[PDB]
């Protein structure tokens, strides 16, 4: 179970996510071509680094 660093490309505006959770589109730090969208709580901005544990699922709404 490795730990994948990742960085925010775009915060997403009109997802309809519940409350403090905001969806975000993140591009990996190892293979920077692969990018997925993921749910994020807390204040997040463009171009900052997240740490995620499970990479296999693309996050729903």
């Amino acid at each position: 179970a490795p730990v994948k660093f990742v960085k925010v490309t775009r915060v997403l505006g009109r997802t309809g996510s519940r409350g403090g959770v905001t969806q975000v589109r993140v591009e990996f730090m190892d293979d920077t071509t692969r990018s997925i969208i993921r749910n994020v709580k807390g204040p997040v901005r463009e171009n900052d680094i997240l740490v995620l544990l499970e990479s296999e699922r693309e996050a729903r709404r």
Binding site: R14, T15, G16, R61
Partner: peptide, 17 residues
Amino acid sequence: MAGERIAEALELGMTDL
């Protein structure tokens, strides 16, 4: 729900194809 709407319609069309 707009993106989820067009995504599920894309999947419906893909199974139809």
